[PDB]
Amino acid sequence: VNVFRLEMEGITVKGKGCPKPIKSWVQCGISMKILNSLKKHGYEKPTPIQTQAIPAIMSGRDLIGIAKTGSGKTIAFLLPMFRHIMDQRSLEEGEGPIAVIMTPTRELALQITKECKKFSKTLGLRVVCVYGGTGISEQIAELKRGAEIIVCTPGRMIDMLAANSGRVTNLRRVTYVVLDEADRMFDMGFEPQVMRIVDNVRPDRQTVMFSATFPRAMEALARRILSKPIEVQVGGRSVVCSDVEQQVIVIEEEKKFLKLLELLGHYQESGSVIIFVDKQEHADGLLKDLMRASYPCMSLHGGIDQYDRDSIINDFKNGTCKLLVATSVAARGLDVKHLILVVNYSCPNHYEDYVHRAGRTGRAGNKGYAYTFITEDQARYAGDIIKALELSGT
Amino acid sequence: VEEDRNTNVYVSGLPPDITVDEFIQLMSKFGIIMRDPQTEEFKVKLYKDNQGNLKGDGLCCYLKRESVELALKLLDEDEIRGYKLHVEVAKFQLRVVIIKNMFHPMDFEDDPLVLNEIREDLRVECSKFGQIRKLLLFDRHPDGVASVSFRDPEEADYCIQTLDGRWFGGRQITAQAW
RNA sequence: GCCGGCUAAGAUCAAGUGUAGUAUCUGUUCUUAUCAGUUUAAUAUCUGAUUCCUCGAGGA
What we know:
The structure is cut from a larger assembly and holds chains A (394 residues) and B (178 residues).
Chain A lengths: L2 H6 L4 E2 L17 H10 L6 H11 L4 E4 L6 H15 L11 E4 L3 H14 L16 H9 L4 E4 L1 H9 L13 E5 L1 H4 L5 H9 L6 E6 L4 H7 L7 E3 L11 E7 L4 H11 L7 E4 L3 H13 L4 E4 L5 H13 L4 E4 L14 E4 L6 H9 L8 E7 L7 H11 L2
Parallel strand pairs in A: 2-6, 2-7, 3-4, 3-5, 5-6, 8-13, 9-11, 9-12, 10-11, 12-13
Antiparallel strand pairs in A: 1-7
Helix pairs in contact in A: 3-4, 4-5, 7-9
Chain B lengths: L7 E5 L7 H9 L28 E5 L3 H10 L3 E2 L4 E5 L7 E5 L13 H14 L4 E6 L8 E5 L2 H11 L3 E2 L2 E2 L1 E4 L1
Antiparallel strand pairs in B: 1-2, 1-4, 3-4, 5-7, 5-10, 6-7, 8-9
Chain B binds one RNA strand of 60 nucleotides through α4.
């Protein structure tokens, strides 16, 4: 029932027919060797980019993932590919790899080969040992004995394809095409080499691309080579609106009412504002304290009747009530044009309620103000609030 | 509660043609500074010291109480350019880095905006190491000589350590001291 | 400092700030291990070598 909490963690997902992210590597549909390598490497919890890319690579569809530096994109490209190679074994034909990994640098290709050897440890699968600027005879002797994956340079791959040392057959040769640092491969320098690498490939083969940054033109160039791609970045799915300004202040539980009274008294946050509370009795007490302080305020919660809540909503929409106290039920789905300010005095336990409270004000391209009071008790939601502020650009 | 050990000194009998620099100079005779937020307090006039000149009173603070006591015991009825003034406690009132191999004169012949952009990039690189007092770029030198003069030699040494071996525009630039 | 100990007794890596100079602050690791050489007043430091048990997993 907590499938929405994995998507709210901050992982923009785009595409049709996207599988659910896995919580751990033990229930991700991986083989025994990949799980043994993950247990030997010391991975207790998987990365969110890895949890978004591993079912998309296990399902057999094209995926394009973007994340920060050092997030584990090489392991996220090597582990489901090795799991699909171990689960669905094929005949190791001559001079034909089952996977093609493209790296723009020789040191990056050597690091990808070392990561693939560490992910395929305690097994007979040796992928590749080749780099640019070295002896081609040793690389040909290493590739002639058997090659599972092909992680090298595009120039070395073009030289191997021109000298008939390595190529992709038409019927069944490779099933996955990995592209590490796809922003550099889609540039003007590596355009015809990547075009000749993608042209001489099998028709029934998946294409994977991973990079730290991705421009619009590079993504538009890379989307033409894939067939129905699935995008995965951060953050978009269940994220806060960028048009509404978010503010977080560190105050106590008793000082929150004084901060709200100072924002209503000194600043212009009393009129046309929606105040989110934790419970209905606390919202009624805050509404009574606002009405006792010579300020017109209305309240809408589950403890009140439906007609009184409708009258309070009509008074907030018409302009009769300056402030409107509401619970978490009115945070999502409410579309009021008068709600310009969103005062979150009580922080919710879930980030989706805070995202719905921030998105309730300043919609349809308009600006908005959102001020939330962060306390010491909401320490678990501070990381989610920081991730939402980093995704929204606040 | 607290009776003695007061750091607030009230100077009375000051002419309205006085300024704040004179008050700071007079307070420096018995103290050092009281510029906690930005600076120290001054006299409170009618319109917040904007319309009126001064309401015959000025406030002075010091770091220690002994200095304030000595000033009150010595600066009593001090004569300033306009008149004599009294002092009370309360009164029931209130270093050059040289960079080479950075640019070429041939690149500035067909690009008049590349030299200014390179100079702005060099200024933005030199501003992160310290306060740059003077920055010059020799556009007619074949080796690409540039001089960055800062206020402190430690910032110039840090800029020479951070600029040596670094790449700028596809060429390896070198940095040395002066 | 408190009544031998509670790891505030030492060395050391990365980054920030700043001075004419000294410096100041944040985040680590600390070999828990052996032998040979360097070296130190002595440490330190550096330079090299070194299958079994338990419930596919962990420890040695």
